[PDB]
Amino acid sequence: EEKLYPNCDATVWLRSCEEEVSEPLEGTMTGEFPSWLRGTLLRNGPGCLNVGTMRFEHLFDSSALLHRFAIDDGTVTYQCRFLRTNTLKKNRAANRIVVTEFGTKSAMSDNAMISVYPFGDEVYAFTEGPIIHRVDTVTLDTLEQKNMTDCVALVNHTSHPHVMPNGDVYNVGMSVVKGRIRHVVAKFPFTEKGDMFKSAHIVASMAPRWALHPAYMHTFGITENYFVIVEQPLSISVYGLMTNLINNNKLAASLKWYPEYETHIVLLSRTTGKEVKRFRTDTLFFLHIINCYEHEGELVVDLCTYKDAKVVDAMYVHAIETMQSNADYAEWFRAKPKRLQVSLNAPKMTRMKSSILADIGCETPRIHYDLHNSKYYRYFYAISSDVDAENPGTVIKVDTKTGETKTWCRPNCYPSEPIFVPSPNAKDEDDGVLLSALVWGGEMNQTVALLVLNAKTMEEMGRATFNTPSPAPKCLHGWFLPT
Template sequence: MAAKHTPVYLKETNNSLIWMRSCEKETAKPVEGKVKGELPQWLSGRLTRNGPGKTGFGDTQFNHLFDMSALIHQFIIHDGRVTYQSRFLQGDTYKKNLKANRIVVTEFGTGAYPDPCKTLFQRFMSFFTPLNKRDITDNCLVSVCHFGDELYAMTETNVMRRIDPETLETVGEKTNLDEYLMAVNTATAHPHVDPDGTVYNMASSFAAKGGPRYTIVKFPPPAVVNGKKKSSLDQARVVSSIPCKHKLQPSYYHSFGITENYYIFVEQPFVLNLKKFLLNAYLGKSFLAAMEWHSKEKTKFHVVRRDTGEILSTKYASDAFLTFHHTNAYEEDGHLVVDLCAIKSGDVISQFLLKNLSQGDFQVSPSDLPHHRRYVLPLRTQGTRTNTNLVTLKDTKCTARKLEDGTIFVEGQVISPNIIDLPRINYKYNGKPYTFAYGVEVNPLGVQFSRLVKMNMRTGETQLWHEEGKLVSEPVFVAAPDATREEEGVVLTTLLDKNNPTFIALLVLDPTSWKEVARVECVAQGKVTQTFHGQFAATGDSVHLL
């Protein structure tokens, strides 16, 4: 059902502890689903999704939601029929944990237990292994993205894993980005893709000359160079490098913005303390143990020209906030409009510890969860007066004022009072003016994805979709062939049943009416787990957008 915007959250009586589900059996062989309603005739392709699938190994349990073993889910749509399958990502980390029957590789929030397969001497010598040679997790559980015709599972380390798009089997050895780009320590799981197939991403180099830096990386489409085929990774290069504000405390980030002419990087005061990180690496402590939230610091916006890689000299700042997900950004009348999901504090990360999510009555304050916010950055600031609002766009409450030191201090506008995350758009409007965004409403009870949200970014109107007893996932917009309108297409998401752990359905919504068009219900071989992000690959397309 569709409903007009309301800030009232669902009062669920049954928290099914959806995040604590652990898949004991993959659905390796595709199972066909039962179609209800009518699928669009033009809809054909693969919806591949990624997320946490296993809570632990043996008698050891992961500590954090971001640590659980990656489980890849996929729906294949062809000739009006739909199949579902799932496979664990068979990376080195998964295999080592499985063999040892315990967690032996450190994750974001879980320190490794001693590997019983190693002798005492081997464990001792591992403390002297350089960081770039140590066991970096390849548990890529956040998202998936195509680089040319190759599909990769991604996380926030410098490692990706290639997967077969037809079988979901893990292909070959792990891909280390530092083999293609010098000294890359982390990268986001949220790249951007241009219409020609060029992929852009943000990465960090902690040991760069002159101190830690954030780098913008370009992966051109596959090509033949001097008679030899070059993959996107083979052609990877850095297009710009941004110095960290604090040399020993680089910012955490999860995504970034891009427009037709600019990149936008948000440097936030949720930082990695490198001193703690280096010590913890040798003590076997987690990445999370070295993270710090500095509430009195400002959040910085760095703007970089796409044509030259030049960092604009104008400094933009706001009161501290944390963001995981950018929605979109675009240029309008000498301004950059930046839309994202903002959280007031980095302390929210600890809310996702499994010891919290395993409590049936666990609830987070709505103020500690993401709200959709817009910021407007004026590009023409030289010669302007201080303490004067430089935002001249109509229909916005955003402000930008020049301070005495020349910094442009920006204040954002909340688009909707709903708790909204995992935002997606019609990606053909990425980096361009747009009207609609889609996401999930996060229920403070159990941090569950309870309702689907459609936002009109110009009017602030919000529409909600919900079905009793079901949970939704990130909505993915699929544009109709030869579409001429922004809403022309369908929105795909998955439905989980709170009480039936083997139920999964593909839900198809009409973006205009925000009503159900069709659904395909499947029965999995084992428990179905929630996912974070996914990508649709249309049959016949050579470039797969996000």
């Protein structure tokens, strides 16, 4: 009758928005918002498990729900609107699940629920299939879609492209070249006058370790001189995926875990586009690389690591529903931030040094991205990933130099991925604020807030709180657009 994880309400993930907030909701302000903070926080995430009388069976299948916090002069409004995807249209028309999903068989999907990223002045919602959807940054209307297979011959891609200071976008994905799978880096070059998608081209590539079992990757790294590919022993079975698509099996069965093999860190030259170096580390699974950089002949790769890929199994609806009696659930979610380090001049297949960055589980990490991505940095921000923590909704700041942590948490409160915004006359790396979207657990399922933390102290500066007309689903990733 009793809970193994009494301080954790996993059912914050199991909500369906029943009514869109199309018109801006006025927010109840507490504390003191920074007056200088002006712009739009966009969020994306799962937002509907229901499809007529049917129900999705995995969280990754849940319908993409966009969120908008408009911030100006200490006032904040809230909106949320479903992304108008092909999958949503087809499922709603049929009033049932007619598209095969990651975790659900139909009775490829374009449910771009993972993230939102800027391509110049435009913003696109992503999943890892090749179709992305443009989003109106004011109204959350779904505008045109783009097909990355048509655009640059990507059959799939990560939902976490890298955005350069000059506006250029890089992303990694799979491409079939002369009947063979290759991992490729696509570049979407920014110019005011041009079209980033029209001028998109492949700038690097890499052969998979196993020709018909290419490695899955959710993120990739970039340094001054290299694209960094972390090739983990979780693979997509080409024939498996084809089979499941034909026979209408959930596509998750396409993933294969091979723990007898190690993880490789592969550097592709930004100059030549070819693999130039490769190193080894332990068998691990990862989703989010924190940052990569070169410093005085050393390569640094910071990422949030698991021992295996069981976190995927943890996010089945049934697994979430029954987690309070699951003795292994916390271990499935057991992530640890690690620094992988090696000399750039070291021989090929040298083992990397692997160090823990902090003695606390971290996920959905962010940094002072605009100034520190691909470069030396000191601080990252994340959310606690320990299911069995005293408070599993902790916002964490890690000082990578010292190992010092600073935290913010409140009872029954579940903050999102924190996004860093620098202060107007910023001197230091952590001279700014964190924006986080809050939901609450238990029966407090129709309240959302924008939290603003002081990045130096991790103290709450201010908060805007909203009530939604229907259940408020928990989001995944976002982006801040300054005015």
